[PDB]
Amino acid sequence: GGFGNQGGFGNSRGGGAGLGNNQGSNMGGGMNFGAFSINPAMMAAAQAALQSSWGMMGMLASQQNQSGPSG
Amino acid sequence: GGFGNQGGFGNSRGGGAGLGNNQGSNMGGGMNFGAFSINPAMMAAAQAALQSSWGMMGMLASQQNQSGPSG
Amino acid sequence: GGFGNQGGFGNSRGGGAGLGNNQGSNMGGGMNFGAFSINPAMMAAAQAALQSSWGMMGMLASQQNQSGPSG
Amino acid sequence: GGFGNQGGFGNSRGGGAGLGNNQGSNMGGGMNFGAFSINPAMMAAAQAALQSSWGMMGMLASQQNQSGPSG
Amino acid sequence: GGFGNQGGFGNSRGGGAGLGNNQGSNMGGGMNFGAFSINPAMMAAAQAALQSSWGMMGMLASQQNQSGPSG
């Protein structure tokens, strides 16, 4: 319906195999035989994130605003 | 319906195998034979996150606002 | 209905196997044979989180506000 | 419907195999026999993220705003 | 419908094999026998991200705004 978000993320309907395998949004995982130094950032400063919708990996949202801020 | 969010996250309807396997949003896991240094940040400063909707991994939301702030 | 959020998180309807396996939003886990240094932060400062909806991993929410703050 | 977002992410409907395999948006994972130094950033400064929708990996969103800020 | 975004991400409907394999938007992963130094950035300064929609890897969004800011 209105403001509708329907994310399937079907991935492995049948199946999933393999020594290293992964479905969906992935920011690492599975098997690691060494260093894993993964630091993602999404920071806000001053008049940040106004009237926005931050998604780094696959998001789903619906939004509605009418509002005047001040500082 | 209105402001509707329906996330399936179907992933492995049939099945999931493998030495290293993972479904959905993943920020690490499974098997680790070494260092795991993973620090994600999402920080807010000053007039931050106004009229927004932060999702780093796959979110679902519905929102409605009319409001004037001050500082 | 109105302001509706219906997250399936179906994951392994059939089954899930494997030496390292995990479904849903994952921020680590399973098997760890070494260091695990994972520090995610989501901090608010000053006029932070106004009129927002923070989700880092896959959220579900519905919201409605009309309100003028001051400081 | 209106403001509709329907992400299939079908991936492996039949199946997925192989020594190193992965479906969906991927920011690393699977198998790692060495260093893994992956730091993605998406930062906001000053009048940042106004009237926008940040997605680095495949997002889904719907948005509606009418609001005059100040600083 | 209106403001509609329907990303299939069909990927391997039949199957996916091979020693190194990956579907969807990929920013690394699979198998790594050495150094992995991958740092992508998307930063905002001054009057940044106004009236925009940042996607580095394949996004999906719908947007509607009428709002005059100031500083």
Author numbering:
A (entry chain B), B (entry chain A), C (entry chain C), D (entry chain D), E (entry chain E): 281 to 351
Text from the published report:
Based on the abundance of peptides with respect to the spectral counts containing at least two repeats, we identified that the 82 amino acids containing core peptide (CP) regions between 279 and 360 likely formed the amyloid core of TDP-43. Under the same in vitro aggregation conditions used for the FL TDP-43, CP formed ThT-positive β-sheet-rich fibrils of different morphologies. Consistent with the negative-stain EM data, the cryo-EM analysis showed polymorphic CP fibrils exhibiting variable length as well as a tendency to undergo lateral associations. A combination of three-dimensional (3D) classification and structural refinement revealed two populations of ~70-Å CP fibrils. The first CP fibril population was reconstructed to 4.1-Å resolution and was composed of a single CP protofilament with stacked subunits along the fibril axis with a helical rise of 4.86 Å and a helical twist of −3.12°. The second CP fibril population was reconstructed to 3.7-Å resolution and revealed two protofilaments, which were non-identical with stacked subunits along the fibril axis with a helical rise of 4.83 Å and a helical twist of −3.09°. The atomic model was built from residues Gly281 to Gly351 into the most resolved density corresponding to the CP fibrils of one protofilament. The density of the second protofilament was mostly disordered, with disconnected loops, and was not used for model building. One cross-sectional layer of the atomic model revealed a novel ‘H-fold’ conformation of the CP filaments that consists of six linked β-strands with rigid loops and turns. Despite their similar sequence, the recombinant peptide 279–360 exhibited a very distinct fold with major differences in secondary structures (β-strands, turns and loops), in comparison with the core amyloid structure of brain-derived TDP-43 filaments or TDP-43 fibrils produced in vitro from the entire CTD domain or shorter CTD-derived peptide fragments.
TDP-43 is the primary component of the cytoplasmic inclusions in ~97% of ALS and ~45% of FTLD (that is, FTLD-TDP) cases. Full-length TDP-43 (FL TDP-43) consists of 414 amino acids with two RNA recognition motifs (RRM1 (105–169) and RRM2 (193–253)) flanked by an N-terminal domain (NTD (1–80)) and C-terminal domain (CTD (277–414)). The folded domains of RRMs bind specifically to the UG-repeats of RNA and the TG-repeats of DNA and play an important role in TDP-43 function in transcription regulation. We show that TDP-43 filaments contain a β-sheet-rich helical amyloid core that is fully buried by the flanking structured domains of the protein.
